[PDB]
Amino acid sequence: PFITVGQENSTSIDLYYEDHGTGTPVVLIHGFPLSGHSWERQSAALLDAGYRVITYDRRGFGQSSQPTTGYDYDTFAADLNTVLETLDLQDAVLVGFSMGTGEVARYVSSYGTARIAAVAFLASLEPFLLKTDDNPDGAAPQEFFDGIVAAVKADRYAFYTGFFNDFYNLDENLGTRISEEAVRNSWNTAASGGFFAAAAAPTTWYTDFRADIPRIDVPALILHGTGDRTLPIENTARVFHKALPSAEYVEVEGAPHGLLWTHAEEVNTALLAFLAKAQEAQKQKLLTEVETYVLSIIPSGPLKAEIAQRLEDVFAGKNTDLEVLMEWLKTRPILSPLTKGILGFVFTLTVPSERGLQRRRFVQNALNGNGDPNNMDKAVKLYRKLKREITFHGAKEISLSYSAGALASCMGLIYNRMGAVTTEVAFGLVCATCEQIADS
Amino acid sequence: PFITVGQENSTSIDLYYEDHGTGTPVVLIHGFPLSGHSWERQSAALLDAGYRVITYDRRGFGQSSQPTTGYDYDTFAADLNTVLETLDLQDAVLVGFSMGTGEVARYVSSYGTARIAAVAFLASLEPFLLKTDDNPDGAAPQEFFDGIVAAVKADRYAFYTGFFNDFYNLDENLGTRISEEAVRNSWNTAASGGFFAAAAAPTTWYTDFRADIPRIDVPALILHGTGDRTLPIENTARVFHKALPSAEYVEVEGAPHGLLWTHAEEVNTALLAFLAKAQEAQKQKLLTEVETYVLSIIPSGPLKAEIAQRLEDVFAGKNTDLEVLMEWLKTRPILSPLTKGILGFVFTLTVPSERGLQRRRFVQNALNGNGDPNNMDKAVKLYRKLKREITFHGAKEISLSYSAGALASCMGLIYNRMGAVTTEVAFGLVCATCEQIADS
Amino acid sequence: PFITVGQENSTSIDLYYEDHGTGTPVVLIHGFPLSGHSWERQSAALLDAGYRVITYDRRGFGQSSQPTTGYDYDTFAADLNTVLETLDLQDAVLVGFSMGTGEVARYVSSYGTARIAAVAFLASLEPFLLKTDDNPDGAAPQEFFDGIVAAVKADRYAFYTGFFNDFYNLDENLGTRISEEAVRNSWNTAASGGFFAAAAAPTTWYTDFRADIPRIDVPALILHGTGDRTLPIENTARVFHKALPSAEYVEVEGAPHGLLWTHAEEVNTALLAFLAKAQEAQKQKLLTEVETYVLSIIPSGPLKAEIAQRLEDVFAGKNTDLEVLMEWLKTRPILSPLTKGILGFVFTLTVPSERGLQRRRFVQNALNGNGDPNNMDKAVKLYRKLKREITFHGAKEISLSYSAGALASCMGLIYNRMGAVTTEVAFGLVCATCEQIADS
Amino acid sequence: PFITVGQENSTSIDLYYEDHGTGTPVVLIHGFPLSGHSWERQSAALLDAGYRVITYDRRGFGQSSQPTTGYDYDTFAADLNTVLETLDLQDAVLVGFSMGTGEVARYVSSYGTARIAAVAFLASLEPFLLKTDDNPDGAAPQEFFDGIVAAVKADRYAFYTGFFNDFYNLDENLGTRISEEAVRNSWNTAASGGFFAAAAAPTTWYTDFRADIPRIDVPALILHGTGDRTLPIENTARVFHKALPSAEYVEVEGAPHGLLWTHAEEVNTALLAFLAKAQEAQKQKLLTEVETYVLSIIPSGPLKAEIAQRLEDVFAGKNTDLEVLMEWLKTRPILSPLTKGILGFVFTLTVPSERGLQRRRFVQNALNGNGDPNNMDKAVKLYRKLKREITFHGAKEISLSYSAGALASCMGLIYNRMGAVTTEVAFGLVCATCEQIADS
């Protein structure tokens, strides 16, 4: 599979990518000089955990096009933007390794965390590798990196051998954490890359990400091996943690630069933990917002408390019966039809096991709103806008511009299944609907 | 330029008007029997002082329509209301002369000081010209004004000659403070007016503004010449000052009624001083808005404090070096390129003595907007809209509809001098650019 | 990237190719049993020397289709013809290695040197490898080649090792001029080829090119290693030189057959020298055309002569200074502002050391186009088209469709750094603006 | 009548203009501080001579809008460009006076002589009024012009009195060549202008037109009075004549600056002469092209000679009877219907006194294009393109892309009056029609 990110002369620039599994999108950005297939140990684990795994090969690496231009992090991040937009990924998590951390930092800084839910940095370059006067926390001076470029240009194939020796810490890990054959494959992948890209890549390593770091607002994870030879822990992760103290910090003892394979077990554990925790963290903050908004329209009393209880139960994951819940709603004495309708919409939306209940009439009759053609006109116009929308805060603001009558019908469109919007947006709509009703 | 204020038979009633310069709006309302062009000496001074000068001709006067109806201050004030609402002026200053003072008093009283920041009364009619029992401070009785009307009806053209004799105090001022040609022009303007309006106007002079005066809440200025023959100082301004003691009172010694031309230097000085207090007040509120918006994108730290200080300094007029500031900006390690670009744009825009400093490379590369032809296209579409715009709030609103990428490139258009927008509009753009960045 | 050269059954026959860099087209035709990537040491050098490098994989080799037909030099040359015509290459240089030398000879003979500027033969097969009665200068008889084919059919994978043993002269060069990993990669590339193509290829080696040689009219270079085991110097290059005495003859002492890698330094040197003669020749015709176009806008006089001289100086590389030239331009009285802008653009473009000179104001104001949004809109539309373009003629042709006003603004976009186009394209634009201005 | 040339704040910038008479367009650009009505002596004469007279008032002058921006010759020329394009003038003559000469020079330089047939400079500013080191032929230094501006600002009305004293050389010419009332009117016109424009205009006088002069390729006329006090002959016209030696030079002895009125007879004579010569000159070069193309389709013989003679006669102005010509054509042997059709089209187009002859049956049936709907479709598509076209050379090229059958029908559309194209474009079509037929 390929995604076109540019054009070089008579040829086009396409990136090889892979899209597997169903769930929240997790983008895995490989490091030098490998490819997307490097994540296979992580990829295997993430697929088991019910995630949607997306991997791609950087330009001039793996199966991607090998142009002789655009080897800078502004172009690398631009490519990632194209990738995310082409696939239309929403609420996705970016995971970068080695060079890949640079792409994450730069994209977030330059394009914003709109589509991004969280970020993870494994074996990061950040904040600045170059050792200069203003940056004494650099790993090595300019002259050093110039040596690497010249080394690759001398003989890239022979370079790869020496490269992977410190990439995996073979003197320690060979025959224990990484096999001879596994290394052999990595070398093949390296050779498969572009000759130009090979020597062009090291110049990108001393990129100054210090300006990109503050723009990271989504939950972050910083992971790094102490036995990292290529990128020394202290010149990278340790100072990176000072720049981003909010980030979850993980130090894997004795892990080499290539810990994705060698210490895969420690990596998976740490990553899957961070992902599951950050997911439930944003689920709770979303559901508590929905609760307060829905309860805002319900009049204070013993009924309000009962509703609050059943809402908490389904939000907590306590598999309640839906036929019973709906029969309970239908039979309520002081609740207004619209209130019952909104509640009916919210319960079907949040309940995982629909159990087999056909779209109830009492909910449908509540949301239609007299079946005014004036109301259904604004409802489709709003529906068009919500299809493009993804953020909850984004979906709520644009919906607020519409009247309470138009909003109710819009909810009815979705309920009847004449509409296909994401849950975050659907919650945006219902919260906006509740807000208008509360002010009436 | 015209503004429709009514309708008379098959024809409509339009008022000729002029809108010049950029800044706080200053509306100049002419007197009898001239036109907006009478302010030309004031307009010249006000334009130099960076104001937005708006003048219009009263119905049946100058280039305005000449209907045979609506010659009362309730209609005159209604016309002014239409003018202010059509142009949507906000925080504007009303300046009236002779008859024009009546419009100011009545509009403020009848329509409220919502759009008005301050008011000025030059050669005022207020509070009441008619000499009666209840008003002994009147200048002349009913019978007198009936004489003027009958005099105009006899021969308005011959009337104009005798009128300007006391309007300018020609025995004193002719050949000294006003030339023969200047008077000639004034006469032409008078003759150019409506025959009906000419004789209808004097009846409006004895209007009772005594009830309108207390309704003046905005800061006021009362100016009047002691040598005023048309409107005697003691029957007008002096008693007006007792009715409005809060007002700034200025008495120009030996000045006649048409002091706008003869004693233009004394008038301008006094007026610009009174105006400057209200103008500097609105300039700061504009700069504090820009400051908060610009600081919104800068990440918290010691650097944020440093920028805010340097911003306050240039806004205050503390002539800071620009070559130094730009080199300081260029060399910051944690500032994003876009951030450096925006600040650079702001500094060149706010710093007076640009000192012939060539368009910095680092700012141009920040504002280029990744040289996306799609981003560059949207920027021009926005530039077309901003070329028409004049207000800061108006420029900010329409800019918000564009993406952050499109906005940055549009700023680049202006910075590179491929675009020509007013400073108020330019600030609207930069503030809109900051708002998008803050939301990511 | 692929180019369809034929069709075999249900599938089509596509050749993998690569197009890098901007300048004179240099087509590199690889030998047996490798691929286009073999040129990587030459390609790297050629890109530095400002050439446009075009490489492709022969059918059944590398990433190209692997059909079981068309393994003859009439088909091989037909394929090259398709490649050249598809890319529409003009004034290009053909460089062949081993088998690749045959394609050059055959194409030139069969299709003519219309698109070709010069040709290069490295480790040539020419004129005739087969040892017969009429050709005693053959390297080996028919039976020998039958042995190779049968050897490949036995086990192609085991064959490759023994092949590369004499291809690189490993007993001498291994560990000195070629590393184990480099050979390893070559083997992988070999295995990656088609099984049929592998055994079909040797039969093409004893092709009689003796009739094709006289048809070479473009300047030729003959390079060969004396230590060549695969193609013995005396049976190949030496007799080839007798057949083509006009050709530039280079003998690399002790170089093996695969000298492209082992003696890459000697090869690059020799090749770039020969290429420089052909490159500089059409380079001058490019600058001479630009000169005539630019001078077309300058009004005749002593100033016109002065400009022409300074243009010739910068084209020769003597002048080198830019700030003085720009100051000289700025102060000229007969030059239209647009003319000053165009010349300033050309000078910054042609002067090698732009130094630390900020983009001059007088050039920006000339190219700004008055800040008409309509000129800016057409300018962006033109700019996207120029981003795709590569040729000088291609850039000039598409630019001529735009108005002089739109063109000037387009130049302004690039000058201001809101645009990124190649020098050949940049010159196309300048000539097009000059053509329009001269025609206005 | 007004033409919108810009926008200032809430108001738009419109220029007052007048379009009188029928024939080739002669644009008259007034000087400071008057208006288009100043040309009345020329306009009356030009209308008698059967020309199309176009006059307009400069911004801030006469009946035009009075903005406070854009008082520079780049803006003045931009305005003129709008005027010419809005009216879609082609083959027009530009005539400038005082300030008006600057507009002519700048437009020609900046926009090209596409729509321009010839140019005239009366009482010119050119080439450079400012007296500096680089320009010793200047009239006065910078400080001098600064005095003029301050004089206008002092008292705009009183300034005019002294201005017209030297403008007309009243000590000499008053009561002889100019009446008291005429000057009075000039003063009124002066007062009618904008207060801002009045003082803004003098700064434009020291504009450097030296760079604009060489771009003048159309036939030129330089007229100037020796007794010119405002613009001394030696500092203006005399040095202008050296810069433009090709121009027809006329020196009116003893004429003042405002010679347009005083020496109107001498001015008209010289002007009408220059126009008549330039008019017949452009007729001959165009008609001889039409002649050769039309004769190309007529078969060689005595008939071909007869046609050429009658063509030369009508082109020369020997208005032959059209009823006779058409009957001569109709009853003529050996002439093909299409040939008769083409000639019939040409004769009705070139013959002045149309006499009142109906679109002949023999012409319509020739032009019908057999009644093919495909031919009628292509004819309309071409007609759309020709409506946009203006040049004769431009019209022929785009028409050549269409088939001879489609071209014939397109001519038929115009002849039947279902189409409205200019004569120059109309000639382009017929020549293109002849060219396709000629190749058969």
mmCIF file of N, CA and C in Angstrom, chain C residues 125-150:
data_model
loop_
_atom_site.group_PDB
_atom_site.id
_atom_site.type_symbol
_atom_site.label_atom_id
_atom_site.label_comp_id
_atom_site.label_asym_id
_atom_site.label_seq_id
_atom_site.Cartn_x
_atom_site.Cartn_y
_atom_site.Cartn_z
ATOM 1 N N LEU C 125 31.452 -4.394 -24.387
ATOM 2 C CA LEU C 125 31.406 -5.690 -25.053
ATOM 3 C C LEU C 125 31.971 -5.530 -26.457
ATOM 4 N N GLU C 126 31.664 -4.383 -27.056
ATOM 5 C CA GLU C 126 32.053 -4.037 -28.423
ATOM 6 C C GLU C 126 33.503 -4.381 -28.772
ATOM 7 N N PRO C 127 33.766 -4.689 -30.051
ATOM 8 C CA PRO C 127 32.796 -4.736 -31.151
ATOM 9 C C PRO C 127 32.123 -6.097 -31.302
ATOM 10 N N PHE C 128 32.827 -7.161 -30.932
ATOM 11 C CA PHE C 128 32.312 -8.510 -31.114
ATOM 12 C C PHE C 128 33.057 -9.471 -30.193
ATOM 13 N N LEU C 129 32.323 -10.108 -29.287
ATOM 14 C CA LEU C 129 32.928 -11.000 -28.303
ATOM 15 C C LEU C 129 33.185 -12.395 -28.855
ATOM 16 N N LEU C 130 32.328 -12.832 -29.769
ATOM 17 C CA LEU C 130 32.401 -14.188 -30.296
ATOM 18 C C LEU C 130 33.660 -14.416 -31.120
ATOM 19 N N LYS C 131 34.351 -15.515 -30.836
ATOM 20 C CA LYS C 131 35.552 -15.880 -31.574
ATOM 21 C C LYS C 131 35.172 -16.769 -32.749
ATOM 22 N N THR C 132 35.294 -16.222 -33.953
ATOM 23 C CA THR C 132 34.958 -16.948 -35.172
ATOM 24 C C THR C 132 36.077 -16.822 -36.200
ATOM 25 N N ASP C 133 35.825 -17.306 -37.412
ATOM 26 C CA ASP C 133 36.803 -17.189 -38.487
ATOM 27 C C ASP C 133 36.980 -15.740 -38.928
ATOM 28 N N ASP C 134 35.870 -15.092 -39.265
ATOM 29 C CA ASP C 134 35.889 -13.697 -39.692
ATOM 30 C C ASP C 134 36.253 -12.732 -38.561
ATOM 31 N N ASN C 135 36.081 -13.179 -37.321
ATOM 32 C CA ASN C 135 36.426 -12.361 -36.161
ATOM 33 C C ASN C 135 37.343 -13.091 -35.185
ATOM 34 N N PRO C 136 38.659 -13.044 -35.445
ATOM 35 C CA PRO C 136 39.676 -13.690 -34.607
ATOM 36 C C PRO C 136 39.956 -12.902 -33.332
ATOM 37 N N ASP C 137 39.506 -11.653 -33.297
ATOM 38 C CA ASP C 137 39.683 -10.782 -32.138
ATOM 39 C C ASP C 137 38.628 -11.042 -31.071
ATOM 40 N N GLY C 138 37.923 -12.161 -31.204
ATOM 41 C CA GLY C 138 36.928 -12.547 -30.224
ATOM 42 C C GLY C 138 37.587 -13.042 -28.955
ATOM 43 N N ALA C 139 36.864 -12.956 -27.844
ATOM 44 C CA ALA C 139 37.395 -13.384 -26.558
ATOM 45 C C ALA C 139 37.283 -14.895 -26.387
ATOM 46 N N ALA C 140 36.149 -15.454 -26.798
ATOM 47 C CA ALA C 140 35.899 -16.878 -26.617
ATOM 48 C C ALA C 140 34.913 -17.406 -27.655
ATOM 49 N N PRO C 141 34.991 -18.713 -27.963
ATOM 50 C CA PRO C 141 34.090 -19.320 -28.948
ATOM 51 C C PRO C 141 32.680 -19.554 -28.404
ATOM 52 N N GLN C 142 31.791 -20.016 -29.277
ATOM 53 C CA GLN C 142 30.393 -20.269 -28.940
ATOM 54 C C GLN C 142 30.226 -21.219 -27.753
ATOM 55 N N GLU C 143 30.988 -22.309 -27.763
ATOM 56 C CA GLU C 143 30.915 -23.351 -26.736
ATOM 57 C C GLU C 143 31.081 -22.796 -25.330
ATOM 58 N N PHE C 144 31.940 -21.790 -25.202
ATOM 59 C CA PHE C 144 32.214 -21.170 -23.913
ATOM 60 C C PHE C 144 30.954 -20.542 -23.340
ATOM 61 N N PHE C 145 30.299 -19.719 -24.150
ATOM 62 C CA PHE C 145 29.090 -19.031 -23.726
ATOM 63 C C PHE C 145 27.973 -20.026 -23.428
ATOM 64 N N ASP C 146 27.966 -21.150 -24.141
ATOM 65 C CA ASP C 146 27.000 -22.209 -23.874
ATOM 66 C C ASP C 146 27.248 -22.789 -22.488
ATOM 67 N N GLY C 147 28.505 -22.743 -22.058
ATOM 68 C CA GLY C 147 28.880 -23.218 -20.740
ATOM 69 C C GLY C 147 28.331 -22.337 -19.637
ATOM 70 N N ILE C 148 28.398 -21.025 -19.838
ATOM 71 C CA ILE C 148 27.879 -20.071 -18.863
ATOM 72 C C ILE C 148 26.374 -20.220 -18.675
ATOM 73 N N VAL C 149 25.646 -20.272 -19.789
ATOM 74 C CA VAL C 149 24.198 -20.446 -19.760
ATOM 75 C C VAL C 149 23.806 -21.714 -19.011
ATOM 76 N N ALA C 150 24.485 -22.810 -19.328
ATOM 77 C CA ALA C 150 24.242 -24.077 -18.653
ATOM 78 C C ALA C 150 24.628 -23.993 -17.179
#
